Design a protein around this ligand. Structure first.
Ligand code: H8H
Length: 288
């Protein structure tokens, strides 16, 4: 099971104020009392959240096996009475979805964000892991513009005896057709979700965003794949099209997409993304 579970978290960390909800539990800011670095603490009431427990175990397992600058760093899991503390690196720049709220991105920002997402997917997929919930809300940034994949709550693991998954998980607007159909699928599902995320970064919202999620559960397998419509560069449109193939084996790998024209021509230093982070802080501060 979970061999490296720890105890007595408050000997090592200080729990500070609530900073969000992780659907499983609450998320708190915290301090590593050893380094004085800020951490993010997700507290899960084990007494309450009873059948997502197998998902909790899954999230912990996957995280404890990841070591990448492009994946939210995992400190450890701590048992404390009826509570499980999952302690991770704090990322202060908000999510990519947050950064969209004040207005449109330009294609340099879109490419920069996508390139780092792609480095994350390359890492995960090389580790036979599948994120299965790629969307802007699960892409978090440090206050200086580093970009990491977050929320491994439904991440899947492939093995020598299980080469495909088939579980119905993810977020409907971003889900690949084969996942909705619960066919046998793999990392190529993440590549479809990446394509929807590209549209989301460009347009602000995924295709079908105004419809009830249950509707899209039939629309996505039925309809032709979405395309990126509007006045965007040809390489961006082709990048999206490449990802959004109904046939999974025809989608490129993350490795391959890192050499796409759109990425090569437009991605720049992640530090430039602090402009976006500042735009959000400004916007959020004057929001009524
Ligand atoms: C103007 N600003 C307001 C302050 N803000 C800081 C952003 O704060 C976070 C919030 C987190 O919680 C998430 C809840 C789900 O949506 C995304 C935000 C962070 C986070 N969450 C987290 C997730 Cl998603 C999954 C497992 C976890 C987690 O914490 C420990 O275990 N992780 C890291 N940093 C967070 C910072 C800036 C803008």
């Amino acid at each position: 099971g979970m061999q490296n579970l720890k105890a007595d978290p408050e000997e090592l960390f200080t729990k500070l104020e609530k900073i969000g909800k992780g659907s499983f539990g609450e998320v708190f800011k915290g301090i590593d009392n050893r380094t004085q670095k800020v951490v993010a603490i997700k507290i899960i009431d084990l007494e309450e959240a009873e059948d997502e427990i197998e998902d909790i175990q899954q999230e912990i397992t996957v995280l404890s096996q990841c070591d990448s600058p492009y994946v939210t760093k995992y400190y450890g899991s701590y048992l404390k009475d009826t509570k499980l503390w999952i302690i991770m690196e704090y990322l202060g720049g908000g999510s990519a979805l947050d950064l969209l709220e004040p207005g449109p991105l330009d294609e340099t920002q879109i490419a920069t964000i996508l390139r780092e997402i792609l480095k994350g997917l390359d890492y995960l997929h090389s580790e036979k892991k599948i994120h299965r919930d790629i969307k802007a809300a699960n892409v978090l940034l440090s206050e200086h513009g580093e970009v990491k994949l977050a929320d491994f709550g439904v991440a899947g693991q492939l093995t020598d005896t299980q080469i495909k998954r088939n579980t119905f998980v993810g977020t409907p607007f971003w889900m690949a057709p084969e996942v909705i159909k619960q066919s046998a699928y793999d990392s190529k599902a993440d590549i479809w979700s990446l394509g929807i995320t590209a549209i989301e970064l460009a347009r602000g919202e995924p295709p079908h965003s105004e419809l009830h999620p249950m509707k899209v559960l039939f629309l996505i397998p039925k309809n032709n794949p979405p395309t990126l419509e509007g006045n965007y560069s040809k390489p961006l449109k082709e990048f999206v099209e490449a990802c959004l193939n109904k046939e999974p084996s025809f989608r490129p790998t993350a490795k391959e997409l890192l050499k796409h024209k759109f990425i090569l021509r437009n991605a720049k230093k992640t530090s430039y993304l602090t402009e976006l982070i500042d735009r959000y802080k400004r916007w959020k501060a004057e929001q009524s």
